[PDB]
Amino acid sequence: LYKDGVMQGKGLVAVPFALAPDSLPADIPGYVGFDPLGLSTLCNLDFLREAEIKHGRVAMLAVTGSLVQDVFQFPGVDKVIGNAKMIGAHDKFIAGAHAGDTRSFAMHQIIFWVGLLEVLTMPALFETMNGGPRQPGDFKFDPLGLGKGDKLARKQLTEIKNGRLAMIGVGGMVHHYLLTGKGPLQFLA
Amino acid sequence: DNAMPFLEGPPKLDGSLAGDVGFDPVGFSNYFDIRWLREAELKHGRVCMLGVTGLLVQEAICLPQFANGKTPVDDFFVVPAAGLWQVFFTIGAVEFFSNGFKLTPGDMFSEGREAGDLGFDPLGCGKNPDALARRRLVEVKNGRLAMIAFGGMLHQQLLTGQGTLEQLANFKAIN
Amino acid sequence: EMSEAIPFLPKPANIDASMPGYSGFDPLGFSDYYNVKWMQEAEIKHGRICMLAALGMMFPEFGTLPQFSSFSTNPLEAFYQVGPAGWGQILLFIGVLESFSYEKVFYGDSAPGDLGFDPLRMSSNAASAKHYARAEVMNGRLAMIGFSGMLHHAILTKQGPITQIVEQNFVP
Numbered sequence: 001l002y003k004d005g006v007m008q009g010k011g012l013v014a015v016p017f018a019l020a021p022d023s024l025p026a027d028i029p030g031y032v033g034f035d036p037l038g039l040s041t042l043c044n045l046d047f048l049r050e051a052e053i054k055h056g057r058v059a060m061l062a063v064t065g066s067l068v069q070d071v072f073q074f075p076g077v078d079k080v081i082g083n084a085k086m087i088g089a090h091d092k093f094i095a096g097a098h099a100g101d102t103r104s105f106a107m108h109q110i111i112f113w114v115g116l117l118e119v120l121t122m123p124a125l126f127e128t129m130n131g132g133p134r135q136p137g138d139f140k141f142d143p144l145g146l147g148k149g150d151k152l153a154r155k156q157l158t159e160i161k162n163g164r165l166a167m168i169g170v171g172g173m174v175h176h177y178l179l180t181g182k183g184p185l186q187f188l189a
Numbered sequence: 190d191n192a193m194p195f196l197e198g199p200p201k202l203d204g205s206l207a208g209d210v211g212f213d214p215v216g217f218s219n220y221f222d223i224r225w226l227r228e229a230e231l232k233h234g235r236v237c238m239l240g241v242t243g244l245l246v247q248e249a250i251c252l253p254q255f256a257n258g259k260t261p262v263d264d265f266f267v268v269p270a271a272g273l274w275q276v277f278f279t280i281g282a283v284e285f286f287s288n289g290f291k292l293t294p295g296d297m298f299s300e301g302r303e304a305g306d307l308g309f310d311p312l313g314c315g316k317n318p319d320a321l322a323r324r325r326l327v328e329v330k331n332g333r334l335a336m337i338a339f340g341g342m343l344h345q346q347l348l349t350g351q352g353t354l355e356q357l358a359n360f361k362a363i364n
Numbered sequence: 365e366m367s368e369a370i371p372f373l374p375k376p377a378n379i380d381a382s383m384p385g386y387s388g389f390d391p392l393g394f395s396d397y398y399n400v401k402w403m404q405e406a407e408i409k410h411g412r413i414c415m416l417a418a419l420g421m422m423f424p425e426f427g428t429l430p431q432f433s434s435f436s437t438n439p440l441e442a443f444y445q446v447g448p449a450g451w452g453q454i455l456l457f458i459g460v461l462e463s464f465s466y467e468k469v470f471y472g473d474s475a476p477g478d479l480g481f482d483p484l485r486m487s488s489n490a491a492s493a494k495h496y497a498r499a500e501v502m503n504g505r506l507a508m509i510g511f512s513g514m515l516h517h518a519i520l521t522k523q524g525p526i527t528q529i530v531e532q533n534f535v536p
């Protein structure tokens with residue numbers, strides 16, 4: 001791993017009075033020592049790792065869309081949605097789809113295609129949980145070939161960390177909405 | 190010497206612990222572990238020393254965040270409930286961490302730890318053994334005294350409906 | 365060798381002090397006929413369910429979830445006031461939990477009660493593990509008695525335990 005024994009892996013203890021489970025191994029990218037509640041004993045480890053990675057990647061796309069939708073709106077979105085954004089938009093899209101408007105079907109298209117991708121990629125979960133050669137998070141998706149060597153290792157670490165960071169960010173960007181409205185950059189300034 | 194001369198000396202009270210005058214007429218030490226009894230006695234006494242000080246200070250001083258009641262016992266019922274729960278759970282955290290998550294008579298003294306010694310000695314205060322013994326005696330005696338004192342002050346504040354020093358002056362009687 | 369709960373009877377043969385809640389109490393001799401480990405697993409499960417049940421007969425008197433704030437504080441009315449969908453979800457969750465118990469009990473050789481649920485590892489210390497092993501069975505039996513009481517009292521009074529106590533509705 002990238003700086004194994006220093007940044008992640010063996011020896012590192014995050015909470016000194018609540019040790020992580022000894023069932024939790026030391027060769028997963030992102031292992032710092034942090035499982036004070038022992039929640040790795042209540043589920044399969046492959047399912048937990050791949051769930052963490054998927055939650056993180058969805059959160060990464062959610063933050064980079066949450067900022068950009070405050071910055072840039074696509075042409076003609078103002079005719080359908082108008083001045084709404086974030087948690088409202090989803091709702092009113094469906095409301096438009098409930099109204100009869102044959103042009104506000106964005107969330108139905110994305111739920112269709114993302115659900116099809118999830119349905120087709122379920123056997124990757126099933127083969128990973130049976131000790132197959134696929135590791136959690138590995139869909140062999142490297143078009144540009146940039147992580148083709150040792151450079152992968154560092155990237156893995158940063159991925160999970162940015163994923164975790166993104167996982168926090170959306171929550172703020174959602175609950176900060178639910179009190180006030182507005183949006184991330186409208187709430188910062 | 191024995192506190193009760195007409196009864197025989199309790200066999201489990203050897204005089205090693207501070208405050209031992211031989212006073213166990215019921216014979217609580219004949220049934221329960223003496224370390225658990227000493228830990229309970231010190232905890233009851235320490236909480237009561239803080240309680241006596243609180244009953245004396247909340248009679249006069251009220252933090253501006255809160256809104257003082259007529260009596261320091263009535264002071265409990267004017268605090269927001271969430272603040273009392275915060276205090277309760279902070280005390281629970283202290284009880285968990287100070288005992289090493291060993292909170293029961295079956296595991297509290299499994300590592301041979303001393304009763305009442307939770308390793309809380311910040312300000313020096315524990316290097317002279319000759320002062321340590323005398324301060325053990327003072328701590329246990331003031332703990333028992335503050336236990337009886339706190340009981341009296343709380344029950345008298347409940348009865349008269351006035352504070353402790355507010356009852357020490359202008360004292361009225363039951364009629 | 366005599367039983368320690370009933371000192372004038374002989375000690376029951378098929379219950380030992382290695383079992384966590386042992387007190388030598390089997391005057392009807394259930395352990396002489398039935399499978400003792402099955403009875404241990406069943407006692408632990410009945411007690412765990414009653415621990416949750418004895419807490420849940422009392423807790424809506426303190427407060428309810430905001431979606432269930434209009435529901436009655438009598439448990440035997442709030443049982444019906446929940447729709448079939450919520451009870452079906454509860455039953456499905458209990459079935460998911462009991463699938464593990466099915467596998468362990470009918471196909472495994474673990475200790476009685478051991479479903480592998482120790483996330484905090486509170487049984488790592490040996491003396492603490494012994495105390496917790498006895499105390500789970502003790503509070504389970506206590507909650508069995510207490511929930512039995514709370515159920516038949518709620519039948520009689522049509523109100524919760526705290527409400528019947530503070531109203532002092534003690535006579536049928």
Ligand code: CLA
Binds near residue numbers: 278
């Ligand atoms: C991590 C440190 C921390 C933080 C951030 C807070 C924060 C707060 N405390 Mg507090 N407290 C702490 C540690 C902390 N406490 C400790 C260690 C003690 C014991 C020594 C106390 C004892 C204490 C008392 C006695 C009171 C507070 C109160 C308050 C709140 C004042 C604002 C208010 O009334 O609106 C909030 C108003 C509401 C109606 C919301 C209910 C309050 C929520 C539940 C607060 C959540 C706090 C959160 C869980 C962090 C607490 C950690 C916990 C271990 C103590 C505020 C949220 C006051 C309070 O709760 O008033 C209501 C109050 O009276 N605190």
Ligand code: CLA
Binds near residue numbers: 060061073074089
């Ligand atoms: C969690 C992901 C997520 C979700 C749910 C949404 C949801 C939404 N976006 Mg948004 N967006 C996202 C990410 C996301 N976005 C990202 C990552 C960007 C670019 C930085 C944008 C940029 C964007 C703009 C500019 C606009 C929206 C708009 C909208 C709304 C209308 C739907 C639409 O046309 O989307 C359009 C979304 C896109 C074109 C982005 C899709 C790009 C994907 C994520 C690239 C994936 C590449 C990757 C290699 C694929 C891997 C697949 C697999 C192997 C794992 C809707 C509320 C519109 C709106 O209503 O404005 C308020 C609008 O104008 N989005």
Ligand code: CLA
Binds near residue numbers: 421
């Ligand atoms: C035998 C167990 C049992 C049963 C059958 C019921 C049944 C019912 N409860 Mg009840 N309840 C229980 C236990 C139970 N309760 C306990 C133990 C509590 C205290 C937390 C409560 C608190 C409670 C409230 C506050 C309310 C109900 C309500 C209700 C009714 C609606 C269902 C609902 O929302 O449940 C909610 C029940 C729960 C959320 C309890 C879940 C207990 C889980 C399974 C234990 C979790 C284990 C562990 C701590 C998980 C973390 C581990 C981690 C740290 C590793 C229904 C009649 C509602 C009602 O209609 O009231 C009038 C309502 O508002 N219950």
Ligand code: CLA
Binds near residue numbers: 509513514517
């Ligand atoms: C945790 C245990 C517990 C507690 C504290 C209570 C408390 C209460 N019950 Mg209850 N109960 C319980 C368990 C409990 N119950 C159980 C397990 C059942 C069976 C399901 C009942 C069935 C029940 C009914 C049917 C009624 C009560 C009622 C009552 C209330 C008044 C009882 C009273 O004073 O007269 C009752 C006392 C007696 C009749 C005297 C009993 C005399 C015998 C000889 C003593 C037996 C004691 C015990 C079994 C120990 C045995 C000794 C051993 C050597 C074998 C009170 C709130 C009454 C109520 O709420 O009315 C509205 C009522 O009618 N209870």
Ligand SMILES: CC1=C(C#C/C(C)=C/C=C/C(C)=C/C=C/C=C(C)/C=C/C=C(\C)C#CC2=C(C)C[C@@H](O)CC2(C)C)C(C)(C)C[C@H](O)C1
Binds near residue numbers: 414485
């Ligand atoms: C597994 C374990 C843990 C877990 C855990 C769980 C959460 C443990 C928590 C458990 C709770 C549910 C235990 C409940 C006990 C209830 C009974 C004993 C009270 C019964 C009352 C009776 C006596 C009565 C009544 C009476 C009635 C009859 C009549 C009335 O007039 C009077 C009265 C009211 C007195 C954790 C999460 C820490 C992690 C760990 O790694 C693994």
Ligand SMILES: CC1=C(C#C/C(C)=C/C=C\C(C)=C\C=C/C=C(C)/C=C/C=C(\C)C#CC2=C(C)C[C@@H](O)CC2(C)C)C(C)(C)C[C@H](O)C1
Binds near residue numbers: 090091167168174
């Ligand atoms: C501080 C700290 C630490 C920490 C930490 C912790 C504990 C972090 C805690 C994070 C928290 C509390 C996050 C909470 C929620 C986030 C969510 C759900 C995210 C997105 C929600 C969304 C998109 C939604 C939605 C919705 C949508 C879209 C549709 C709508 O119709 C509905 C709805 C509005 C619901 C560490 C570990 C470093 C240790 C340190 O010593 C102390």
Ligand SMILES: CCCCCCCCCCCCO[C@H]1O[C@H](CO)[C@@H](O[C@H]2O[C@H](CO)[C@@H](O)[C@H](O)[C@H]2O)[C@H](O)[C@H]1O
Binds near residue numbers: 443447
């Ligand atoms: C923990 C174990 C889990 C298993 C429990 C699942 C049981 C599910 C059944 C109860 C769910 C609701 O079912 C029930 O709802 C109606 C009210 O809402 C009840 O209707 C009636 O119920 C009782 C008489 O039957 C009356 O005291 C109610 O006032 C009345 O409303 C119906 O009898 C039944 O349809």
